[PDB]
Design a protein around this ligand. Structure first.
Ligand SMILES: [Zn+2]
Lengths: 67, 323, 480, 94
């Protein structure tokens, strides 16, 4: 069982060391774009209808037919 | 405005007599003859064209909005969830009670904890087994209920890949398809709620193997249709002969940067910022913008009953040395 | 097969393909020794406390590594993830750590390159197996190791830098390799070897006619070492042995045998050595001569009983630089291809006046350097405040420790142009302040003209008879 | 030579500057072949014409700031070709 328990304890060690066993939570690192999104939260976000972005499979068909 | 009319005049566009080199090369259809923009406008869609232009302007200016999720099954775009949204999901799992019959099985075994000080939060961990035996960490698919987004992220960094779940009365189930059906280090995989018909963890038995854990495979096993990552941008192309707005949608081609990882890796974000402020340097006049050769298709949207002609870029990439 | 049996069989197949010497039949006697070796080092930490064998790790060949890898990576065997992480954040601490991988590297370590225009020693080192040859960088090499088969337990692999077309990546060996076979300890000299000491040797280097009777050998502490000089064909270096350190009486020696260029890595100052089977060379313009090595020359570590000592102002801006010896660590790169680095965030280091062609593949943040007889030029001008340490051929660069950090991401504006600056220094023969200024001026020009008007690798190509290069032509009117 | 004005221009990746080349003292630039060459000049004049639409009442108010209602400059350069060095930009190559 030494090998088996060692393997399972490796997994358990990774888990528990990663888990916040006690105390308060902590802030992870944040990248440029993520922090900028957090700061800009509330701006009217940009988006586009997929209809405009080539939902026309008929046009796709005759396009791909072209040489 | 007098200076207005002057600056307007110096902001005009010279008709391709220039000495500069191209910034972008099209990978395919190079044989096509150049079609001036005006010639395109005077023709009805759909059609293929090969053009040379400069970006007079592009959107969105704040690039952190440019990334979108995409479902290929129904061709639907979807916004990326914020970390606050994921928190609003994971928060409902912190208070749940683990069930005895969901602990240890032929397919997965578990370990439990109660995290102190954190309002008495409950957490349970389950490890999936290969042929009934725990695989090595590099292949160890791990399942969580009660872990936070940061914790599950840091754990996914260590284990192969991890699946958020909750206590289903029959068997473990993804606590919400809004959350990632699979997080694999810096990669979060999501699914289309419309097209999906999800399945419980036991249905991992449908997999060809219990070692690769290919995201597509496990998504199919769990009955989830995975969403692609794509950039979506609008280029305001100008060629003096005319002005044309064309959309760019691509995954890991145009910028040669993985749209799946860009949101979580900072160097890629620096890279895309640099690219877009190298096509469109800040402040200086359109005289100095570099030429941009690209291949575009045209097609009729007809959402307004008819017409609504649009253009989309294809098969083009930034030149190697320009990056 | 069992997991362990499967692993053993896979390792045996790998050895049969990659490592069994083609000189002989695939002798099975090899596999038990390598298995014992890897098991030994795996257990030596006592941190495994489980599997007797690191089944996780997978063996790799040289060609396999070249074709499979295209990222920086570290392959520490016999360390826990905890120890690996702590070591990776040991010095930075916040620096980007080399990503860990679980590969086992074994092969033959030797000076012999694969090239054949000459013997092509050139002081290079390579790891060899059946699949190919790969160059490596090693600290304080014991020349005894050359030619033996080892299991390297701690190494970094760095892919070829993006700018480099040759694509010849290189390894970094962090610690002494574990030889697969038991130690082949061979007997040294029991007789006290007669050697001339530096004072008598100096007398003889003056009075070359008196080179008779006394044995043509030497010994002493390495007090001064030169960089490797590479002429049209003659690649050579010079060193100096002193009777003591710090002390006056010392004698210089020139080493020119191609097979012996590898010694340049073996030697290190302070330690005392024995040189043998020498002759006194004659060089144009050297009134006092120097001793030189023959093909029969042996390099040997000194042990006393093994030797017998044979004894017979803006008013006038000209300013002089101060020699000294320095030890420090590179904090960051100012201009990589020109060879301008920060030491400790305090001193500028300009290598361009040495050959500098090899160090560029090692030099990155966190490297530890010891510089001997570096010229210190403070107040160098051109707006550059930082005093610029600058080695010349008389000094030498000693790598103390490799870097833990992964190399910086390639930027097309940054890497290109080393040949042009090399030309500036070794053909136009500029001085240090003007070289600094030219570097900054070419930065400005590249910021004006490239990449849209003229790509960098065209703007900064070396001026040649076939075609000149704008970078030199736009500067020439001022340099003249 | 900018085809929206006919006037010559020195141009690079940062913008453009109007220029007034002379071939030599009392002889104008006469050769179309200079288009696109890389011009280097280290003995040149930078001119600045200032237009102002002031409303000062008298010599007294020339100490006051509020009356300079509009300011326009018009900066350009001028020099002889004999004082410049001219290099042709190479073609792209690989
Ligand atoms: Zn869908």
């Amino acid at each position: 069982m030494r090998e088996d328990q060692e393997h399972q304890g490796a997994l358990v060690c990774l888990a528990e060391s990663c888990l916040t066993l006690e105390g308060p939570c902590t802030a992870p690192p944040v990248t440029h774009w993520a922090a900028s999104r957090c700061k800009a939260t509330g701006e009217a976000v940009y988006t586009v209808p997929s209809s405009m972005l080539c939902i026309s499979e008929n046009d796709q068909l005759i396009l791909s037919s072209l040489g | 405005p007098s200076s207005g009319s002057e600056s307007d005049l110096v902001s005009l566009y010279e008709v391709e007599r220039c000495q500069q080199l191209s910034a972008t090369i099209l990978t395919d259809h190079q044989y096509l003859e150049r079609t001036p923009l005006c010639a395109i406008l005077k023709q009805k869609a759909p059609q293929q064209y090969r053009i040379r232009a400069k970006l007079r302007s592009y959107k969105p200016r704040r690039l952190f909005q440019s990334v979108k999720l995409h479902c290929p099954k129904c061709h639907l775009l979807q916004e990326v969830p914020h970390e606050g949204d994921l928190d609003i999901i994971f928060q409902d799992g912190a208070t749940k009670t683990p069930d005895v019959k969901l602990q240890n099985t032929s397919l997965y075994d578990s370990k439990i904890w109660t995290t102190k000080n954190q309002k008495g939060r409950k957490v349970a961990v389950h490890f999936v087994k290969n042929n009934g035996i725990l695989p090595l960490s590099n292949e160890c698919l791990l399942l969580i209920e009660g872990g936070t987004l940061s914790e599950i992220c840091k754990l996914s960094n260590k284990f192969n890949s991890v699946i958020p779940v909750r206590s289903g009365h029959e068997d473990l189930e993804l606590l919400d398809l809004s959350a990632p059906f699979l997080i694999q280090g810096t990669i979060h995989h999501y699914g289309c709620k419309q097209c999906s018909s999800l399945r419980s963890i036991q249905n991992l038995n449908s997999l060809v193997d219990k070692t690769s854990w290919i995201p597509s495979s496990v998504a199919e096993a769990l009955g989830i249709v995975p969403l692609q990552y794509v950039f979506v941008m609008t280029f305001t192309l100008d060629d003096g002969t005319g002005v044309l707005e064309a959309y760019l949608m691509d995954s890991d081609k145009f910028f040669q940067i993985p749209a799946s990882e860009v949101l979580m890796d900072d160097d890629l974000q620096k890279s895309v910022d640099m690219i877009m402020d190298m096509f469109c340097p800040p402040g200086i006049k359109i005289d100095a913008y570099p030429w941009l050769e690209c291949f575009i298709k045209s097609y009729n949207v007809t959402n307004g009953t008819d017409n609504q002609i649009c253009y989309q870029i294809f098969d083009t990439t930034v030149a190697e040395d320009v990056i | 097969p069992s997991s362990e049996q499967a692993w053993l069989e896979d390792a045996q197949v790998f050895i049969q393909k990659t490592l069994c010497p083609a000189v002989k039949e695939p002798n099975v006697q090899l596999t038990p020794l390598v298995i014992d070796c890897v098991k030994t080092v795996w257990l030596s930490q006592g941190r495994n406390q489980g599997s007797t064998l690191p089944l996780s790790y997978s063996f790799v060949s040289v060609q396999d590594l070249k074709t499979h890898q295209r990222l920086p990576c570290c392959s520490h065997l016999s360390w826990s993830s905890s120890a690996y992480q702590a070591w990776a954040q040991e010095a930075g601490p916040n620096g980007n750590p080399l990503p860990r991988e679980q590969l086992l590297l074994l092969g033959t370590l030797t000076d012999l390159s694969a090239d054949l225009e000459q013997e092509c020693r050139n002081g290079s080192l390579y790891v060899r197996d059946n699949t190919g040859v790969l160059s490596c960088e090693l600290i304080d090499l014991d020349l005894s190791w050359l030619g033996h088969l080892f299991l390297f337990p701690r190494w970094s692999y760095l892919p070829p830098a993006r700018w480099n077309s040759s694509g010849e990546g290189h390894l970094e060996l962090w610690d002494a390799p574990v030889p697969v076979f038991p130690l082949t300890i061979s007997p040294g000299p029991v007789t006290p070897i007669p050697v001339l000491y530096p004072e008598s040797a100096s007398c003889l280097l003056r009075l070359r006619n008196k080179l008779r009777g006394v044995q043509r050998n030497l010994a002493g502490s390495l007090v001064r070492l030169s960089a490797l000089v590479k002429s049209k064909q003659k690649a050579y270096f010079i060193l100096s042995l002193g009777r003591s350190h710090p002390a006056v009486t010392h004698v210089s020696i020139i080493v020119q045998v191609p097979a012996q260029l590898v010694w340049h890595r073996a030697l290190r100052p302070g330690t005392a050595y024995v040189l043998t089977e020498l002759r006194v060379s004659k060089i144009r313009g050297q009134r006092q001569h120097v001793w030189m090595t023959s093909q029969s020359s042996r390099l040997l570590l000194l042990k006393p009983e093994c030797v017998q000592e044979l004894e017979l102002d803006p008013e006038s801006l000209v300013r002089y630089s101060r020699l000294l010896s320095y030890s420090g660590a590179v904090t960051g790169v100012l201009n990589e291809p020109a060879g301008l680095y920060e030491l400790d965030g305090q001193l500028g280091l300009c290598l361009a006046y040495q050959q500098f062609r090899g160090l560029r593949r090692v030099m990155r943040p966190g490297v530890c350097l010891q510089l001997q007889d570096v010229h210190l030029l403070q107040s160098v001008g051109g707006g550059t405040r930082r005093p610029v340490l600058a080695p010349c051929l008389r000094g030498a660069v000693l790598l103390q420790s490799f870097s833990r950090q992964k190399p910086g991401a390639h930027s097309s504006r940054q890497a290109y142009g080393a040949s042009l600056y090399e030309q500036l220094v070794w053909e136009r023969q500029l001085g240090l302040p003007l070289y600094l200024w030219a570097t900054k001026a070419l930065e400005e020009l590249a910021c004006k003209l490239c990449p849209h008007v003229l790509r960098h690798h065209q703007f900064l190509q070396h001026s040649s008879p076939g075609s000149p290069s704008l970078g030199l032509q736009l500067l020439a009117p001022t340099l003249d | 030579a900018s085809s929206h004005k006919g006037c010559l221009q020195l141009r690079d990746q940062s913008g453009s500057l109007p220029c007034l080349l002379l071939a030599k003292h009392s002889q104008p630039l006469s050769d179309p072949r200079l288009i696109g060459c890389l011009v280097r000049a280290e003995r040149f004049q930078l001119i600045v014409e200032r237009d102002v639409r002031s409303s000062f009442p008298s010599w007294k108010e020339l100490s006051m700031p509020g009356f300079i209602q509009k300011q326009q400059a018009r900066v350009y350069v001028q020099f002889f070709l004999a004082d410049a060095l001219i290099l042709p930009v190479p073609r792209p190559c690989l």
